[PDB]
Amino acid sequence: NREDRKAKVIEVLNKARAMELHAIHQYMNQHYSLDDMDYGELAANMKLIAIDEMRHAENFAERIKELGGEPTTQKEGKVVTGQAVPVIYESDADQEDATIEAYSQFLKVCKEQGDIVTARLFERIIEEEQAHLTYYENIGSHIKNLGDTYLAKIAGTPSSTGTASKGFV
Amino acid sequence: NREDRKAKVIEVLNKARAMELHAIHQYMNQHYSLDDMDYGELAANMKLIAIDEMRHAENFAERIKELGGEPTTQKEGKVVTGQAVPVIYESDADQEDATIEAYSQFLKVCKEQGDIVTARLFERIIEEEQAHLTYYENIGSHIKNLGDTYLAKIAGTPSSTGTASKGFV
Amino acid sequence: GNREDRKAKVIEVLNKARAMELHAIHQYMNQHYSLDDMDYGELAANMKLIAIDEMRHAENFAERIKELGGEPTTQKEGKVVTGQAVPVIYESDADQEDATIEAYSQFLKVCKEQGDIVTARLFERIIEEEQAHLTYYENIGSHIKNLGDTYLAKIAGTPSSTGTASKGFV
């Protein structure tokens, strides 16, 4: 029925959302490390990708409300900390790839439940995850093939991501 | 194959267009009432949504022509007049929901018939119907929950939808 | 007659005219889709622009019907003719605009009889716009009749745009 159709879509939406919450904390944790290491452009792009995941989490939450459900506040999995630079980019590529696989499954569920608006949302976000995927693979390729010679170039670059957060104060 | 496929898509396209024609007359009728009641903001937005349905009617017609068919000129269903404000918003949300449901099945037909262009057309319009649905649900909620304090706020507002219609004269 | 009766007779001619507009909107838009399909851009565009004039007429009639206390009709008068070839489109639209002006002038007399100055003036203004439509259609028809394909060859591939898109909700 209509109610079961919505509940099944809400379920994959909250699963995706929980994955987004995990990515936000995982990438920001890496952001703090790269920043601490003073690899500015890497620090900045890692934070800009975290913000894309924040935006995904919010979009998933808004559709869940539209369907009458509650947006989860729990993250899926655990954040891995203290990763060395090569492990950061190899693991983040792995995560992006597994995310696209899972969201492609969630998309299918939306289509089966005849939910056109939610399947389109997954499709749009999956394209953005593909851009994250390509970025992490590329950095990993340079670390693998060029090592510290590549990092020497990143050392001390600007880490800014733009004007500060439009906020309340 | 091809001929059969085309005919099946033209049939759902005309069914949808017939629903668009119904919606144009139903929403404009309610628009005349709201204007007469002098709830400008509600009057204005109802007409703007009616113009979205006109553009949907026109996009369906154009696709129908591209497929070799003739666009229908009869609306589906009867127009309901004399609806009071609470009924206007409850019914329109009901209509938008039913529209998304039907278009979702029409979309499926396009996919089964291998017509990607028409499927994409439905997809886009369904997203615009979701916006209509949300708008009507929202007005309905404030009329249910707040009445007069909310209606007094709408009383006497501008009902202009912008600059006058580019026409022939 | 009395106040109510006076409004009622005027509401009745307003709904007859409005129903004629609804018909014009669908008939002209039907021809618009065909012209567009044939890729006669300038013709397709002016046909739609005239259909939009009729939408405005329908809306104006409606707003006056509500001001008089009545209910604007949603049924179109007559049926739409589909599949007309180009020469038939312009000959029939010219006939229809003529018939419209004929009927609206009778409707105006009724408004004057019922002592409704505002509604009478509405019909007057709209009759003037219908005259513009008639002259347009007669001129196209005349060139089609006299110049044939050589006239149409010049319209082929012209822009069909009616300007910026429909200020709508989404």
Next chain:
Amino acid sequence: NREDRKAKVIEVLNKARAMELHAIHQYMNQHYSLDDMDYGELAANMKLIAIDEMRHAENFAERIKELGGEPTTQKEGKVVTGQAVPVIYESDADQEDATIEAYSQFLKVCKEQGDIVTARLFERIIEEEQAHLTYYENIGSHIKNLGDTYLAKIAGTPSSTGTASKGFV
């Protein structure tokens, strides 16, 4: 099996790409004739559409690389030269119609191989092929129905396609 889903998608991408290469050479061949016949506006649009097909070939190659494959440099079919003006537009409409049908099928494969990103690529390009189709059908209609009077209007028109190609030198 991850690798087999990529192989199968890469295979249809290279088929579509080969079709793009054919179109590029076919449409530019016709552009050289149209210019030679001094029908500028027709020559110009023919070249602009060939550049669209160049972009498609590029987009397909980029996706083939993201999937780990090698973008083909072989075109499908044979270029037909020496076509008169009516025959250019009747064959090009036929070509575009055949491309949309083929691409719709390739899109099906992408969906079957669980590849949402490539499927969306195909759907985007199919929409552009539909624009090419309509264009060629309209020109061909004018030639069939109006011939010389129509061509008289095109004779001696401008043929520029805009600012010259940003190149290396």
Next chain:
Amino acid sequence: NREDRKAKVIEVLNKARAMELHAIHQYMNQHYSLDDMDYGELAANMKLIAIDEMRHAENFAERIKELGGEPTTQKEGKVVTGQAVPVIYESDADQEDATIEAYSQFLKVCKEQGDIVTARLFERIIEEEQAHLTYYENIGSHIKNLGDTYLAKIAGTPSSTGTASKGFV
């Protein structure tokens, strides 16, 4: 013999053109690989040179038409794929050099056939090939002498070649 003169010039113009068509695909293949490796500046200049080769093909074609011939659509030789970065620049320098040698002979034939306009077209394009040769020798030289130090500088650079291709849609 007028016609004989034209025929011999058209022959070398189609030989040159087939050489251009080969270069477009060879260079673009390498562009796709350099883009994949994320060496943006190299990928960008490779494509810009490919576009210069597209313009050469177009100019040969137009001269072929002025002479009453038909421009070839088949490339000369085979595209080599999978080249390592040093091999890309070593072979592109060899090809550019081979091209200037051939075009220089083709230019001689035009003069022998008393065709001043075609000879001047060759002289102009040869100067551009010299610009290409110099570019490939320079990059080849940095790779030989600087190794991964040079690559480290190119990793992550912009790959943009400007605004998108003015096209039909």
Next chain:
Amino acid sequence: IYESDADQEDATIEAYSQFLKVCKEQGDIVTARLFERIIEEEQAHLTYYENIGSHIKNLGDTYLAKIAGTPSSTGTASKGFV
């Protein structure tokens, strides 16, 4: 071809109609009658060339497609000496 051929037949008939006049003036009834008969034949050529021009004009290549590849024989070969 057909446009100039129609103009040329029309001209001929004009010219021949004056040559006929000269024949009547010189009292040459036989030569007047020769011009009369031949002018009648030129009129058949004129009509033929006008018709082809009109079809080419109004139907173009659609018309020529029908003619493409038709027989061109004008019947049995020239009776000659060899």
